[PDB]
Amino acid sequence: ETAPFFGFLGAAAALVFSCMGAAYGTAKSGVGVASMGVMRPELVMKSIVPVVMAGVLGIYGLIIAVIISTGINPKAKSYYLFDGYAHLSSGLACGLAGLSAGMAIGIVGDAGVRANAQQPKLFVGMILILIFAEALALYGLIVGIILSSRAGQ
């Protein structure tokens, strides 16, 4: 009876935390990009790589929220607490992973903007660091999907 009051909250929290992490990363990424473009307008377009990759976290969060929303089907089956609690936990885990990945990506992009401005020869290293950071977000999304998949009591 109270399971939806947890499942919907978990989905909303997942979306909110993913958005917060994405914004936290994108703020630093945009600050660094603006600084580099002021210093060197030539590489401004190619420096939006962390800025673009930041939105991937938000996209993953939106996908997880959509999956969680599709999970709550009271007509299909009476939603026991065992499903709502699992959905809420999956959403919380996905949101926390997204927030952590966003913070890490923001720090990495803030460093890498200056690193590329001093010398563009470190673009490969910056991209590799960003990919390693986004691996955490991918793992979190996979874990959230796996947890949400266990709604069958």
């Binding site: 377009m45 190619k46 673009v52 939105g55 991937v56 996209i59």
Partner: peptide, 12 residues
């Protein structure tokens, strides 16, 4: 530059 950007940009 076109890679990855186009897919997300279409949805955006």
């Amino acid at each position: 530059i076109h890679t990855i950007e186009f897919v997300l940009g279409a949805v955006s």
